[PDB]
């Protein structure tokens, strides 16, 4: 009945999610578990294995024009920039999003992308590390932790969030709707027209609720657990944003990409 419209929304978002994000959670998991006919990712657990992995992961393709912790961070930065492009394209596919006031689209993306980046990282992560370079590399958690300050502390809170978030066991079809809900948050600072945002989000949440009922019938109040994580994640992103503004000012030899600057300026 009304369920059917919600199911079609879910499916439309899935299809556009698949087009927008080349590396899905399914593909990432296939890789992390070895349930894949492709070669196993090169493991980077220290300085020397980074040097050894450079061909497999194409690490020199980051800087066609430095210190290690900086080089790793620039790699992370490179992908983040592309993540913002993917998130932005996906946002345009959300019914109603592009009819919003253009300053509101910007505001929604500006605050939303970091929250989504955390969920994207979770798909790429286990307890011990993160998939990099389109699944061709695996950088260990302890190697990232062992980097000098402030770089040593950058990735770890995302690892912490990921292990908890991954216990929910969402798939791509869930994630597609969850991500739509994050973007269309009517309580972002500086929004002009809260109402048409909340109207869309209301439909997305209903879609999310039904999706989780149907896709995870054995998981009682997964919806509730999911919304609580979404709130936790806002709080967490505040500290992520702080650390970058710190790094931008305190590290001279590292250039922060202009797009990333746009999204960190005047934020919390």
């Amino acid at each position: 009945p009304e369920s059917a419209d919600l199911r079609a929304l879910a499916k439309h978002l899935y299809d556009s999610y698949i087009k927008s994000f080349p590396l899905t959670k399914a593909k990432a998991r296939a890789i992390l578990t070895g349930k894949t006919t492709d070669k196993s990712p090169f493991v980077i657990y220290d300085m020397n294995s980074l040097m050894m992995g450079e061909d497999k992961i194409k690490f020199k393709h980051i800087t066609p024009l430095k210190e290690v912790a900086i080089r790793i961070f620039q790699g992370c930065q490179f992908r983040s920039v592309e993540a913002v492009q993917e998130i932005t394209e996906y946002a345009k596919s959300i019914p109603g999003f592009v009819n919003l006031d253009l300053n509101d689209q910007v505001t929604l993306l500006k605050y939303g992308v970091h929250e989504i980046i955390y969920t994207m990282l979770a798909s790429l992560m286990n307890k011990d590390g993160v998939l990099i370079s389109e699944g061709q590399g695996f950088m260990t958690r302890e190697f990232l932790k062992s980097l000098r300050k402030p770089f040593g502390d950058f990735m770890e809170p995302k690892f912490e969030f990921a292990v908890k978030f991954n216990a929910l066991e969402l798939d791509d079809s869930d994630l597609a709707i969850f991500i739509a809900v994050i973007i269309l948050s009517g309580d972002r600072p500086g929004l002009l027209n809260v109402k048409p945002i909340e109207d869309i989000q209301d439909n997305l949440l209903q879609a999310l609720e039904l999706q989780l009922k149907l896709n995870h019938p054995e998981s009682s109040q997964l919806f509730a657990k999911l919304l609580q994580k979404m709130t936790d994640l806002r709080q967490i992103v505040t500290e992520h944003v702080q650390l970058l503004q710190v790094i931008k000012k305190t590290e001279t030899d590292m250039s922060l990409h202009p797009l990333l600057q746009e999204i960190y300026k005047d934020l919390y």
């Binding site: 913002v84 492009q85 932005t88 394209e89 345009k92 592009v98 253009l102 689209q105 910007v106 993306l109 500006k110 202009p258 797009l259 746009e262 999204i263």
Partner: peptide, 11 residues
Amino acid sequence: RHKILHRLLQE
């Protein structure tokens, strides 16, 4: 301004 974001959204 958010010039790049604007560009990504409009195009």
